[PDB]
Amino acid sequence: GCVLGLVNSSLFVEDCKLPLGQSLCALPDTPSTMRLAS
Amino acid sequence: IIPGFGGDFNLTLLEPVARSAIEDLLFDKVTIADPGYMQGY
Secondary structure: OOOOOOOOOOOOOOOOOOOOOOOOOOOOOOOOOOOOOO | OOOOOOOOOOOOOOOOOOOOHHHHHHHHHOOOOOOOOOOOO
């Protein structure tokens, strides 16, 4: 899960899936409903 | 943005291919020590 730092949850969900997001880091938006890194 | 963006007007604001030459040079001449995320540890 270490896209920016190691994260312990499901990742690499559909690329174009964060128009708006919680924004865990610089890039990933963590949309849940997991399914982070987008 | 096209490489010959403004014909008679030389523009160094284009992307070398994303951080145009002037942006890169500006970040170079400053002294910053950012930790590589994924690697700082």
